[PDB]
RNA sequence: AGAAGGGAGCUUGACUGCGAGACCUACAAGUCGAGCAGGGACGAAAGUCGGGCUUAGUGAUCCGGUGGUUCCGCAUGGAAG
RNA sequence: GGUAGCGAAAUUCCUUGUCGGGUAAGUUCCGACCCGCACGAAAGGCGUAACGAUUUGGGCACUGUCUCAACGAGAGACUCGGUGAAAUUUUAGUACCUGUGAAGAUGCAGGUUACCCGCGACAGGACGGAAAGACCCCAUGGAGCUUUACUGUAGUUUGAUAUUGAGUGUUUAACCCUCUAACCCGCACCACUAAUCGUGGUGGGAGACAGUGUCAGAUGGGCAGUUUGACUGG
RNA sequence: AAGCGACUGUUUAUCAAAAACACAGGUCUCUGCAAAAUCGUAAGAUGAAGUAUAGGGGCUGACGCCUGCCCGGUGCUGGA
RNA sequence: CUUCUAGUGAGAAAACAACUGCCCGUACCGUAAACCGACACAGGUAGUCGAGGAGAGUAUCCUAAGGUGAGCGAGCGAACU
RNA sequence: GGUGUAGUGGUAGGAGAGCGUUCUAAGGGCGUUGAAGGUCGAUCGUGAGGACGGCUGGAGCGCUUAGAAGUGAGAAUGCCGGUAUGAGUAGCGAAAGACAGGUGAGAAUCCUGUCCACCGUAUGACUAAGGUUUCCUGGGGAAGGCUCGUCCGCCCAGGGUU
RNA sequence: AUCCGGGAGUCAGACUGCGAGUGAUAAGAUCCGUAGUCGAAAGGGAAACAGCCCAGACCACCAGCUAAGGUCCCAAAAUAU
RNA sequence: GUAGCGGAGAAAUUCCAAACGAACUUGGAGAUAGCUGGUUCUCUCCGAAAUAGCUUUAGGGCUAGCCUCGGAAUUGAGAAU
RNA sequence: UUAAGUGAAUAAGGGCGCACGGUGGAUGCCUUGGCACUAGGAGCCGAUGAAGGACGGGACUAACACCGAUAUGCUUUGGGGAGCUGUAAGUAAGCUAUGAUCCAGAGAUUUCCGAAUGGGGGAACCCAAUAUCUUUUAUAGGAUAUUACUUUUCAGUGAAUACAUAGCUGAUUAGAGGUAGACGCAGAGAACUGAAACAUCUUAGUACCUGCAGGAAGAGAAAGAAAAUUCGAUUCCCUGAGUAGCGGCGAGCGAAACGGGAAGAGCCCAAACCAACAAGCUUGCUUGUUGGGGUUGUAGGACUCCGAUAUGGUAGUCUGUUAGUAUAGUUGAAGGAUUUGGAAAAUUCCGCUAAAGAGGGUGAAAGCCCCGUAGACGAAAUGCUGACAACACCUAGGAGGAUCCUGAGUACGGCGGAACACGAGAAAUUCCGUCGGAAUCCGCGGGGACCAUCCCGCAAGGCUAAAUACUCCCUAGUGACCGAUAGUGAACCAGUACCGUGAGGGAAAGGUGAAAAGCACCCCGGAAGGGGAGUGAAAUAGAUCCUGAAACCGUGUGCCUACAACAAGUCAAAGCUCGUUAAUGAGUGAUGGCGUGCCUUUUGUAGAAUGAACCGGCGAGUUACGAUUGCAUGCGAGGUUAAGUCGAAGAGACGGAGCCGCAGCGAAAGCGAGUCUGAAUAGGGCGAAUGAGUAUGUAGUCGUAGACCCGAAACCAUGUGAUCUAC
């Protein structure tokens, strides 16, 4: 009510005019008036305790393993960043669904080659979230990255 | 995230107005008039489902009295006579006989006359 | 009227710490109480006595005064409080 | 402890007091009487020519004011052509009598009366329309006013101390004095200078007073903020 | 013929024009001039380019005849 | 405007001729349909001029110079206002 | 799952379980061989409500599971808009016109004439405020003008103040 | 029924038996005690009728038995003995 | 020229831009109101009160009484004869 | 034929159902404009004439945008490569491959008003003085410069009053005003409200007004925090803690230090003393001006003694050398046929591309058509930020303890007020007014009245980056934010039209189509409008143009209606008319029974108690932070991190200061499974005796905030009015 650019004057009198008592041109029931209880700027985020974060990470990767949906590979090497060779590699292992590609480190040619494919997501081994693993159908992780994940989840 | 009140109220109100077809004037055309009238009709219909069962019983009873006074009896004596003989016809079938099969009605009236002759 | 009424002798229980259990009651308050311990009055004893035949005679808290105290006391010993 | 003057009054409750006048008939009017509920001498008493779109009582003249109404002229109203609002409004196929009922019904009960649709007229009803009663009580509501209601205060006044210096005397420190250099001058003359402002300069007056700062006692509806209980056959 | 107000005047723009207000005349009181009084924190102003036969405040209200008794109370003035 | 001096201070009086002389307003209404009244509104609006007969007259009635017929009509000739 | 027995009026108010709207994510779908919306039907469920078919319409929208909310309207002498009733009703704002002839699609109302009538210390003439182009000429007739209009202080184009 | 805990709403009642006060042993009056209905209760009777008499509606039926109150016609049932 | 804690008043609470027992406009400001009005979908289970005490209290509130939901507990504690 | 009886049909107008139209602008879909933020830049303009305006400039020019008599534009350096002269049609004249138009950097011109400043004034107007130049034979006329006020420096002139100071003239130096409706520091400073009244108190040193700023301000280098064993300038965040306190001890107000972090930085004077100069020439060395020295509590300096005469740094400049960066741009992969349509990006086949599958456009939905994107490249000019160079500044030890220095009307005290969380209180500490008024290292201040002892510091002088606050504005983006009654008041020529003397108040109003192909020609008509014919996939898409709901107004018809008292229906029902989501079918209905709207407030309503003309849209228990209970999950005698750092505005690890629980009793000293009262080991109070918590999510209630929405009469503080009315 008080933020709308408007009036502080009582528009008519309080009695006599055969009217209904009104207080301002900008009241909630007037056309063009102010809003009662709208949206305000808010936060929306909170934190769960630390043991259940770790329990959810372990549980989601262990579910991936319990159904032969994780696929380990020795290495992913590329002399140039080529999308076509990555697609051939992807069919070499018979992968036909949404896949999370978990890479190690400055393996930059592989991440470049795997971008831009509309079924493929790329994450490094220090930056896996719970929402990345649940949304994909499989995980394609390299041997190096697997030990690096075992080093931080401990 | 704002919610316009688009098409829900018109559907509900048009459902109400369709029940008011055949009413007089502004009682089948304006929503408030029709709303009140339809509520009153609901009340009347519930009341009249129970009053129906009384009306037909009085109708049957008066036709049976009319028929029995032609066979030398009245309604109350003939009902007593039929009970003392162990006959269990409805008042519905009795009236139906009274209008369609006068000979069957006379057979029954004679049985009643012999029962309370004791 | 086995006096709670009325006379005579001696006295200060018109005591201190309390209290099982009840009564009344929205709360806060109000009422009765056997019995235990300290030290006593009256009586030869048994005993009775924590005012008056019973039920009116009174006013939360805050704040201030007087007396006691083996309590505290802004670095320490006191003091102010 | 109310004099002169006046008095049923612009004042007298009882009261249409009593008596005389005026009318055929006068609770109003005029004259008088005194038993002034509750007149009275500058919030003046008692007269008073002239004057008043003042208030009161009576006469002559004149009249439709009335007995008691009639006729006539014009404008609206009425019919035809052009134009074209409003307050109001739960939906309505919207009679009368006697009852009933939140105790005065078009609509409910029992009767009685009544073919369908309009035009010109009247105001008995729709507790008719217009204005969330101005009367009365409440809100631990307001606002304006008063005062010997509470608590403050502007203004006025009185003392101490700073600005603030110097000499004599009179008594138990205080006091009366005298001086001139501070401080003051809405006195005169002079310059800045076109000036009744201002600043400087010289005389004159007055003087440690006054004015001004800090602290203290009085007074203070002039002005301000508030308070002024409940029960209750309203 | 009688009441009220001496009179001409003024008043509630828009329900009250009057017996209300004003008035010429009476009386009490304040004020020695940088007057008292009033506007303003002050500077500055009105009073007044006036000076007690003048200026402020209260009451009464032409003119005629008159205007009694009380100073205990309250204000005001003087006292020591 | 008119005098009198003080005054930096060749020698200007008046004849004819011919030349020079800036900025702002200026239409139209204005006792009204053009202003103030929300209206093409029976209200309000300072000043000058304002004729004849009869009359003291700017009163009154009828007229001169000038202006105007007013922005809904045609019938009828009841009640009532 | 069967079978018995018992229960099932309700204001203030407590408790349970659901219907529908918009948006987000994931999944599986539809659409110019016609989405949403609109209109009609004699259809289904215990309720809020859900479908299917015709006509209209022209580009987007369902369903499942979970999440988030400006999430549901009949009432406040509510606020804004549109339209009724009163009703073809009140009123059309002081006053004298009549006829002939013009113009024109069309005339009581515009033009020209003739007679009649009204003001005349004004309803005549001039001017200061105020207004600000309303002034003149040629065209126009949708709105303004309380009727009409060929007319105008209205509308369009040009011009006028020395 | 009692005990612990989460969430309330109510603090204007009315009439009718019965028994008392105020009143005039008046009031559809007023103020208490005790039982019911209404409040928050539809259905039958009492002409119409919150509170009186009978009786407590989950729903369908063109089946049957009764309550209070009734049986000449309006209007169902005896012109009963 | 005089302006709202104000002005002006031959005095009426009179006037200060159609409103004056204290003008108009903006802001504090979404002032406060134990009062009045309104408060939007569905079905299932249960279901009150209109009293006591205290109250600058009497049409407001608080604690108890009377409703609803979840738990615990020995029982044979509740009711009617 | 006569009597007695029974009796249909016929609508002036009305009702119900259905069909088609009109008005009106709801609903759906859509966006041109908004709202809340993130990252980066920038944080002032102005007498060398501002912010904001007035009036002008075009071939035709009313308006908006641009520009200023050089007026729809002029020069110059770069970019770009075929059209162009804005909106804006329409026509007329032109320009451009000798490079237009357009884009970025630097210049030039810039009327008049306004601080407005030669004098005046009712803003955009009027009137001058002095020099130089012009028109005219000449006067009149035109142009250009200069001319306010104050301060602060210097000459000339100068006086009541002689010497000279007031003054005056001239030259020089700076100000002056606006704003970003924000953020900061000061001066002055309310009220309604809460306390269920109201004075202390609260609202609150808040709102409003005035001054001064800066890009940030303010504070800042111990006369400090503490208590043994200490630490070292300021600011900001977490925690301590709703604690210790204050309080008609009521309503309510409410710390700090320790501990954990972001950022870190220190410096300069006065004084003693020593020289150069001038005056007092005491020719004593008193007054002073310049330079040196010297800056502290472990006391430091002067002064005398010797060493050294080097070495560590800066918070500095419009000085050079490069490196980057902001302001234009360049280049940038890969598709055809088929079916349905007016038109494919859709469907079906068969291919290709990706360091590019972000987004927008194209006649419907596109990786491969266009603009782009990932990646690679670029600057003549001007401005910013680094680095390294110069130049400028600043900085030494050891000893001695004879004497001198270390901020005076100051610290402090009485009286009156205020600030500290602290309301005079037992009131320390810090300020303001008034009066009184120290000491000098054998000293002076503080540790919450006061004293003694111990401990920590050294006032009465100056400056200083960062870590923190804010967004008028420019660039690039983001959203389980709006979608035309919403979102800004304003999507559109809006602070406009309109209202008011004024201050001030203040709107309504988006949508043809893919493409204007926007209806040539004919007919009725003065025109408007309409009918054909044409455009087009569609005109019932025809400009009042997408969709096109309801109220409300009409036209046509199947059934009913002129002896009838009607809250308008409901139950029973003949006749007539139809024939559906196909089933115990649909519309109408003579006649018969029964039946007093909806909402609110009430003991109680049909109420002659209250509200609503009708239809459509909008219109009311929300969020933040705390406290408690139920449910749910993870750990379990334990549970858990806050600020902050790295990270995509995210997850996703570090971080153990801190918080709760694990032991109570007592006013406290204190004792402890017990403790307090008590002489008591007595009795009693409160506790123990296996007796579960903690973090997070979710829902119910409560507190502080407007706290479910609407509604006064009033109160206070700035400003605008005597064009009406009073004097």
What tokens were used for A99? Answer: 């896949």
C-alpha span between A109 and A86 (Å, rounded): 10
Our measurement of CA A119 to C1' J336, in angstroms, reads 27
Task: Answer yes or no: is B40 CB < 7 A from strand G.
Answer: no
- Which chain I nucleotides are covered by protein, judged by CB under 7 A? 25-30
b/e burial code for range A30-40 (CB count within 10 A of at least 16 → b): eeeeeeeeeee
Q: Among B114, B46, B42, which Cα is nearest to B78's? A: B114
DSSP for A91-140, please give it. HHTT--S-EEEEE-SS-HHHHHHHTT-TTEEEEETT---HHHHHHSSEEE
Paired sense of beta strands A120-124 and A70-73, if any: unpaired
Contact in structure between B87 and B109 (CB atoms under 8 Å) = no
Which residues are within 8 A (CB) of A125 and not within 5 positions of it... i.e. 6 or more apart?
A102, A103, A104, A105, A141, A145, A148, A149, A152
Count up the domains in chain A and report the number.
1
Our measurement of CA A61 to C1' D21, in angstroms, reads 137
For residue B9, the enclosing domain spans 1-118
Residues lying close to strand J (Cβ under 7 A), chosen from 26-65 of chain B, are: 26-33, 36-37, 39-41, 44-45, 47-49, 51-52, 55
Long-range contacts of A44-51 (CB under 8 A, 24+ apart): none
Tokens 């020795």, located at residue: A74
What tokens were used for A14? Answer: 């309080």
Distances in Å between the alpha carbon of A152 and those of A13, A48, A102, B71? 74, 19, 14, 110
Sign of CA dihedral A87, A93, A95, A99: negative
Contact in structure between B115 and B81 (CB atoms under 8 Å) = yes
DSSP for A74-102, please give it. S----SS--HHHHHHHHHHTT--S-EEEE
A5-A10-A11-A13 Cα dihedral, nearest 10 degrees:
180
What tokens were used for B26? Answer: 């502004």
Which residues are within 8 A (CB) of A152 and not within 5 positions of it... i.e. 6 or more apart?
A125, A126
Task: Answer yes or no: is B57 CB < 7 A from strand H.
Answer: yes
Contact in structure between A130 and A60 (CB atoms under 8 Å) = yes
**A11: phi then psi, degrees, rounded to nearest 5:** -70, -45
- Which nucleotide has the shortest C1'-to-CA distance from A21? J711
Rounded to the nearest 10 degrees, what angle do helices B75-84 and B31-68 cross at? Answer: 70
C-alpha span between A79 and B99 (Å, rounded): 110
Sign of CA dihedral A9, A14, A17, A23: positive
Our measurement of CA B27 to C1' J265, in angstroms, reads 90
Our measurement of CA A2 to C1' J497, in angstroms, reads 27
Count up the domains in chain B and report the number.
1
What tokens were used for A134? Answer: 């649940």
Task: Answer yes or no: is B80 CB < 7 A from strand G.
Answer: no
Task: Answer yes or no: is B91 CB < 7 A from strand H.
Answer: yes
**CA A16 to chain centroid:** 62
Distances in Å between the alpha carbon of B85 and those of A8, B33, B58, B103? 94, 59, 24, 19
- Which nucleotide has the shortest C1'-to-CA distance from B74? H78
Residue A120, exposed/middle/buried by CB under 10 A (0-12, 13-18, 19+)? Answer: buried
Residue B63, exposed/middle/buried by CB under 10 A (0-12, 13-18, 19+)? Answer: middle
Experimental method: cryo-EM
C-alpha span between B24 and B20 (Å, rounded): 9
Which residues are within 8 A (CB) of A64 and not within 5 positions of it... i.e. 6 or more apart?
A70, A133, A138, A139
Q: How many CB atoms lie within 10 A of CB A57?
A: 17
What tokens were used for B69? Answer: 């006074």
- Which chain J nucleotides are covered by protein, judged by CB under 7 A? 15-18, 27-28, 36-37, 353-358, 480-490, 495, 505-508, 549-552, 567-572, 587-589, 593-594, 597-598, 614-625, 633-635, 639-642, 647-648, 650-653, 695-697, 706, 708-713
Helix (H, G, I), strand (E, B) or coil at B54: helix
For residue A104, the enclosing domain spans 1-154
């Amino acid at each position: 009510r008080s933020a709308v650019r408007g009036g502080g004057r009582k528009p008519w009198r309080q009695k006599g005019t055969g009217r209904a008592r009104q207080g301002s041109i900008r009241s909630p029931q007037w056309r063009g008036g102010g809003v009662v209880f709208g949206p305000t700027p808010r936060s929306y985020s909170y934190k769960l305790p630390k043991k259940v974060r770790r329990l959810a990470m372990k549980s989601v990767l262990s579910d991936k393993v319990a159904e032969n949906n994780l696929v380990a590979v020795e290495g992913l090497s590329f002399d140039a960043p080529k999308t076509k060779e990555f697609k051939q590699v992807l069919a070499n292992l018979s992968i036909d669904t949404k896949v999370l590609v978990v890479l190690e480190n400055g393996n930059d040619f592989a991440a470049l080659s795997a971008r831009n494919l509309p079924n493929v997501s790329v994450v490094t081994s220090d930056n896996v979230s719970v929402l990345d693993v649940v949304s994909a159908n499989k995980v394609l992780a390299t041997q190096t990255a697997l030990t690096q994940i075992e080093e931080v989840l401990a | 995230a704002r919610v316009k009140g688009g098409t829900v109220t018109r559907k509900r109100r048009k459902k109400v107005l369709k029940l008011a077809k055949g009413y007089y004037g502004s009682k089948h055309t304006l929503f408030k008039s029709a709303k009140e009238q339809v509520m009153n009709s609901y009340y009347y219909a519930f009341r009249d489902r129970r009053q129906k069962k009384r009306d037909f019983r009085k109708l049957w009873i008066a036709r049976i009295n009319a028929a029995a006074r032609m066979n030398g009896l009245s309604y109350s004596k003939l009902m007593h006579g039929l009970k003392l003989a162990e006959i269990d016809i409805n008042r519905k079938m009795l009236a139906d006989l009274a209008v369609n099969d006068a000979a069957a009605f006379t057979a029954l009236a004679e049985q009643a006359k012999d029962a309370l002759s004791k």
